[PDB]
Design a protein around this ligand. Structure first.
Ligand SMILES: CO[C@H]1O[C@H](CO)[C@@H](S[C@@H]2O[C@H](CO)[C@@H](S[C@@H]3O[C@H](CO)[C@@H](S[C@@H]4O[C@H](CO)[C@@H](S[C@@H]5O[C@H](CO)[C@@H](O)[C@H](O)[C@H]5O)[C@H](O)[C@H]4O)[C@H](O)[C@H]3O)[C@H](O)[C@H]2O)[C@H](O)[C@H]1O
Ligand SMILES: [Ca+2]
Ligand SMILES: [Ca+2]
Ligand SMILES: [Ca+2]
Ligand SMILES: [Ca+2]
Ligand SMILES: [Ca+2]
Ligand SMILES: [Ca+2]
Ligand SMILES: [Ca+2]
Ligand SMILES: [Ca+2]
Ligand SMILES: [Ca+2]
Ligand SMILES: [Ca+2]
Ligand code: NA
Ligand code: NA
Length: 301
């Protein structure tokens, strides 16, 4: 039903629209790292998220480093599993080249180009797919002009050779916070969005204002990862401020994916330790974060 309704997504004047030029707002879940918590990423869990939560997008977080694709590329099969499930379930899917410790996207540029060539050849004809080419550039000397924009200008043509139209999400500096710098020096490709990531327990009004500056320059923004906890993971969840961010995103119709669908014992995790990997969760199997996020997606489903 989701993709049947919306079809091919595109960017129109800085925001995400469907095949009729209607606003569309994607809300869903990110996996945790696929090399760690892949058991939660399967057709049955994603069908449960679609049917019980109301998700219309699922994000497959394929770490590069940290034991991910660079060391054990078999994890790409878990990405394929997620994409094929999303196609079968008629929802959107984000293929995320999940850089983090490898903080400069140029570390694994050759590998990223090969990976995105393969993924876009396989899936580029499906409107379901969204590419996220570098999760979180970070560090004081990884900047838009020197490192990130040129990386994107090399990877995007690789995708476009196979998939001229699907959305590409491009990370920004300072853990995908520096959307203002990207907005002042935008990519030419018309169907790109810039990532903005936050933690409710850490980030506040000054970053909302930074996002608004970017939006004011005509840049499209996808909140492709956010957490209900603090970035430190201390002090529980911060749902008061999370609701402030939910409202902010709704008022700007910003799409989002929440971090993350795992049973790890950390406050951002959506599930309690032991939760069934194939879905069908009881209310006792959702964490406080998961309970809140589920309600946020349900109430617009
Ligand atoms: C003034 O404010 C501004 O400057 C501030 C100072 O620099 C920063 S604070 C800064 O914020 C950033 C952005 O939020 C974060 S990075 C952030 O951290 C998250 C929490 O760690 C992670 S998700 C997290 O990823 C972990 C690493 O992979 C894993 S632990 C990992 O788990 C596996 C599996 O179990 C295990 O095998 C491994 O052994 C473990 O290492 C964890 O489970 C995940 O939840 C997110 O990806 C990242 O964005 C900085 O930490 C923080 O200091 C302000 O942000 C800025 O505005
Ligand atoms: Ca357009
Ligand atoms: Ca807008
Ligand atoms: Ca390798
Ligand atoms: Ca492995
Ligand atoms: Ca090729
Ligand atoms: Ca396409
Ligand atoms: Ca080059
Ligand atoms: Ca404007
Ligand atoms: Ca509301
Ligand atoms: Ca909306
Ligand atoms: Na290897
Ligand atoms: Na505008």
């Amino acid at each position: 039903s989701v993709v049947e309704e919306h079809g091919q997504l595109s960017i129109s004047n800085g925001e995400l629209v469907n095949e009729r030029g209607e606003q569309v707002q994607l809300k869903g879940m990110s996996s945790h790292g696929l090399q760690w918590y892949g058991q939660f990423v399967n057709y049955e869990s994603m069908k449960w998220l679609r049917d019980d939560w109301g998700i219309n997008v699922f994000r497959a977080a394929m770490y590069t480093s940290s034991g991910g694709y660079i060391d054990d590329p078999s994890v790409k099969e878990k990405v394929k599993e997620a994409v094929e499930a999303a196609i079968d379930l008629d929802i959107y899917v984000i293929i995320d080249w999940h850089i983090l410790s490898d903080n400069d996207p140029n570390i694994y540029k050759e590998e990223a180009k090969d990976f995105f060539d393969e993924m876009s050849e396989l899936y580029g004809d499906y409107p379901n797919v969204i590419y996220e080419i570098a999760n979180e550039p970070n560090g004081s000397d990884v900047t838009w002009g020197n490192q990130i924009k040129p990386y994107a200008e090399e990877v995007i043509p690789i995708i476009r050779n196979n998939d001229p139209n699907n959305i590409i999400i491009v990370g920004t500096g300072t853990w995908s916070q520096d959307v203002h710098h990207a907005a002042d020096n935008q990519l030419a490709d018309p169907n790109v969005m810039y990532a903005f990531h936050f933690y409710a327990g850490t980030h506040g009004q000054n970053l909302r204002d930074q996002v608004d500056y970017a939006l004011d320059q005509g840049a499209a923004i996808f909140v492709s990862e956010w957490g209900t906890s603090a970035a430190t993971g201390d002090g529980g969840v911060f749902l008061d401020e999370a609701q402030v961010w939910i409202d902010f995103m709704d008022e700007r119709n910003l799409s989002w994916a929440n971090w993350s669908l795992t049973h790890k014992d950390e406050s951002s995790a959506a599930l309690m330790p032991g939760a069934n990997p194939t879905g069908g969760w009881t209310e006792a199997e959702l964490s406080p974060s998961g309970t809140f996020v589920r309600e946020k997606i349900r109430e617009s489903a």
